[PDB]
């Protein structure tokens, strides 16, 4: 009778901008009875009140898909964590935005969770396109021992064995670093000079201080830094030639929402068929059953093609992640970032402005630098090797 969706935005001020995405329900396909009512609500200060109101305030509006934005407070997916848990039992698809957490990928924990922005795990996939056009094969990296940081660890080697002879060292450091210096000299023998950072922002800043007394930031080095570990304290004490990345749609929600609501109202159009199209289970005093039309239209939303927005490339894989997104890797140049390239499925590297390296050098250095000292093993063998 009426098609309605809900959303969990950041602030009530931005809620009025979401209504502009639901009042435009007339200019969609069919437009027979598509009358979207936002019925949005600002996220509660904590996670306790979310579960105390999600059932009878958001779901009770006969909503079908939920839009979740990043909270203004520096939290760790605080808003969608109980919402996914609550909507997971209710079998309600949820659309995420500005939530670059890689733990929201396995379907066992969150079967119903799709986000319009790829998390930090997909950064390593784009990173693989960098040394292909920069001519390095040997590679070592240091990474935190947490699920978010380690996400890139299984990302790289799954696409490295077919294009390289394995990373030289994949040594890891505990995220709770406290003057952890012994983990750097133990890695300063492989002569890689191409180290990669995929750690948390606070920890990435911590290792920067430890990377000074033994001058690993001099000439002949190249560093890869994740987007999360650039701004803030990680910017301080960092090498001058940081080759980190960012996102074009960083802190952008209306563009993401408009691309989102373009597919929330779209999937309902082809839904109308002779099959089961019953509404989600209404009521909150008693609810145990699962509506059978949930997974039926979930694949349609995943398989829906939307050639609008940012280059019309809002594509979904088996997980909910943007495909062929433009990351446009940054470049630190004297305590400020400059633009040097972009990714469009294949990395594009325009000249733009010079690319600097740690130590102030501009020419890209060969990270091998050889190793004249060599280690040798023999054994006692009377005619050959006396002892």
């Amino acid at each position: 009778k009426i098609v309605n969706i809900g959303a969990v935005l950041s602030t009530r001020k931005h809620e009025q901008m979401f209504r502009e995405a639901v009042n435009q329900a007339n200019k969609r396909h069919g437009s027979w009875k598509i009358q979207l009512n936002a019925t949005s609500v600002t996220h509660k200060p904590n996670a306790i009140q979310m579960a105390l109101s999600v059932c009878e305030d958001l779901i009770s509006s006969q909503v079908y898909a939920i839009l979740v934005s990043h909270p203004p407070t520096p939290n760790d997916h605080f808003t969608p964590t109980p919402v996914s848990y609550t909507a997971g039992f209710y079998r309600i698809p949820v659309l995420g935005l500005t939530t670059r957490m890689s733990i929201y990928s396995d379907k066992s924990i969150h079967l119903s969770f799709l986000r319009t922005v790829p998390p930090y795990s997909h950064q390593s996939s784009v990173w693989f396109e960098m040394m292909r056009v920069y001519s390095w094969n040997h590679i070592i990296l240091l990474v935190s021992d947490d699920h978010e940081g380690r996400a890139a660890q299984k990302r790289l080697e799954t696409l490295l064995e077919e294009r390289e002879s394995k990373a030289e060292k994949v040594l890891q450091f505990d995220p709770g670093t406290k003057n952890v210096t012994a983990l750097l000299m133990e890695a300063k023998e492989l002569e890689a000079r191409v180290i990669i950072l995929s750690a948390s922002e606070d920890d990435a800043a911590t290792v920067y201080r430890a990377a000074a007394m033994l001058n690993m930031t001099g000439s002949g080095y190249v560093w890869l830094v994740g987007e999360r570990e650039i701004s803030g304290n990680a910017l301080r004490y960092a090498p001058d030639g940081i080759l980190g990345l960012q996102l074009i749609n960083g802190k952008n929600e209306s563009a993401h929402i408009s691309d989102a609501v373009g597919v929330v109202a779209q999937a309902v159009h082809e839904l109308l068929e002779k099959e089961n199209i019953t509404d989600p289970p209404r009521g909150c005093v008693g609810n145990t059953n699962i509506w059978k039309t949930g997974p039926l239209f979930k694949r349609v939303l995943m398989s829906s093609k939307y050639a609008d927005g940012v280059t019309g490339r809002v594509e979904f894989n088996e997980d909910g992640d943007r495909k062929f997104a433009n990351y446009s890797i940054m470049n630190l140049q004297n305590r400020k970032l400059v633009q040097v390239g972009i990714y469009n499925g294949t990395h594009v590297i325009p000249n733009d402005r010079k690319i600097i390296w740690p130590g102030g050098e501009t020419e890209k250095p060969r990270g091998y630098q050889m190793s004249t000292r060599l280690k040798i093993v023999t054994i006692h063998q009377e005619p050959f090797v006396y002892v």
């Binding site: 004249t372 000292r373 002892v387």
Partner: protein, 49 residues
């Protein structure tokens, strides 16, 4: 070890010979942990790094 010295005179690289630890030439055998085969002796010392 003489053939080793002539080798270092050609490729211009240094060395520090250290004898093998266990004392066996090397043979890929399965450890007690199921059948995860692991080398020993020189081969273990070379593959490990």
């Amino acid at each position: 070890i003489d053939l080793l010295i002539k080798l270092a005179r050609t490729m211009n690289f240094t060395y520090e010979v250290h004898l093998v630890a266990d004392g066996k030439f090397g043979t890929q055998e399965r450890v007690n942990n199921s059948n995860k085969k692991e080398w020993n002796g020189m081969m273990g010392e070379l593959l490990s790094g």
